[PDB]
């Protein structure tokens, strides 16, 4: 449900301007070459936006993101994990 339900609210928190830099860092790790990167790549991207790759997220991405079994994260799967931590990021 990480992508499906969560992307809906994600766009409410993250602005399109924010998405601009999100996709900038995301695009460099494009695995399928279209809108799709591996969730592990986040390690570098998370550093660019200043997000903390915590224990919860690593455990969360498998069951909530890749319940879909893509082995990767589409931009829709990606936006969620960023805003997920960022929303509570103090």
Residues within the interface to Ca ion (CB under 5 A)? 66, 68, 70
Write down the least CB distance from residue 90 to Ca ion, Å: 28
Give the position of tokens 């879909």: 68
**Shortest distance (Å) from residue 25 CB to Ca ion:** 19
Length in residues, the chain: 90
CB of 68 to Ca ion, least distance (A): 4
Instruction: Specify the residue, 30 or 68, whose C-beta has the smaller distance to Ca ion.
Output: 68
DSSP 57-81: HHHHIIIIITTS--SSEEHHHHHHH
């Amino acid at each position: 449900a990480s992508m499906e339900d969560l992307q809906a609210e994600a766009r409410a928190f993250l602005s399109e301007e924010m998405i601009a830099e999100f996709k900038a860092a995301f695009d460099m790790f494009d695995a399928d070459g279209g809108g799709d990167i591996s969730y592990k790549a986040v390690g570098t991207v998370f550093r660019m936006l200043g997000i903390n790759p915590s224990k919860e997220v690593l455990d969360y991405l498998k069951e909530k993101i890749d319940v879909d079994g893509s082995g990767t994260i589409d931009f829709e799967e990606f936006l969620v994990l960023m805003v997920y931590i960022m929303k509570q990021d103090a």
